[PDB]
Amino acid sequence: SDLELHPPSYPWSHRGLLSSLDHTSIRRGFQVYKQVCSSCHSMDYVAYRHLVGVCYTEDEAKALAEEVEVQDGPNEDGEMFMRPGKLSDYFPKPYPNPEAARAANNGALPPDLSYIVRARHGGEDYVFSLLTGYCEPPTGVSLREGLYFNPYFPGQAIGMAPPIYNEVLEFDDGTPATMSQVAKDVCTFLRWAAEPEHDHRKRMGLKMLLMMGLLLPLVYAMKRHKWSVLKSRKLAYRPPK
């Protein structure tokens, strides 16, 4: 209950000083969010328009948006109606009430998935290991079947039932939906669902380093030039007779 285990470092295609995210892996991961988690896990901060030019085309993202009934605002009469989703709509929340998540899951609350690889220590490594490392409880410790067993979970008792098993839907790419490939793709997508700027910051970061590598010796040489008047100055003391 007190003792813990930390996740190892999986060699992500984006973790590395100048390494951009695998956009195909983000794309695959959106699908892994679309069927599996979205009916239990909220993503209140990401919209369909966010996906445009990243993992899907404009036409593709509009088509994915239309697939849900989003509650629109005041009509001409004074009541709330339902319409097909536009690009500007947020990802749909399964529970409108915070306590509605408790009674319709386990009693425990499933946290929002927008910002999760930045909200838990280890990042995507932890979420990958929590999914991947679902195992049977050791003797002496009774699991209690409202709380499943996971070693990576801080208290060793997690209310989440493992939703990562070989083949939960396929991809347009001829990719086998194995447990590891299912778990990697969500984690590579959740990186983007916490840090969209990722690719851009690595880009300007290279430009930062390449500029400083040109500017640092140059400003040094400017300072060294002006200071050479003092650095090579010679003193002589000539007191009277």
Binding site: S13, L18, S19, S20, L21, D22, H23, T24, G53, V54, C55, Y56, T57, D59, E60, D199, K202, R203, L206, K207, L210
Partner: protein
């Protein structure tokens, strides 16, 4: 090359502070094009295929 490249650069463009500023300004424009794109081209090689600009032809219409 008979008088140095630096010697002819001082004589023509670094003497007057006017042409010194002009050479910096004109040199800032031409540097921005060679750098922005040049550093973007380097960013292409370390992320070969990974970027949307490489994928683009997959989803067309």
């Amino acid at each position: 090359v008979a008088p140095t490249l630096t010697a002819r650069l001082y004589s023509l463009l670094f003497r007057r502070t006017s042409t010194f500023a002009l050479t910096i300004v004109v040199g800032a424009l031409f540097f921005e094009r060679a750098f922005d794109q040049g550093a973007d081209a380097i960013y292409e090689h370390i992320n070969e295929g990974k970027l949307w600009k490489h994928i683009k032809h997959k989803y067309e219409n």
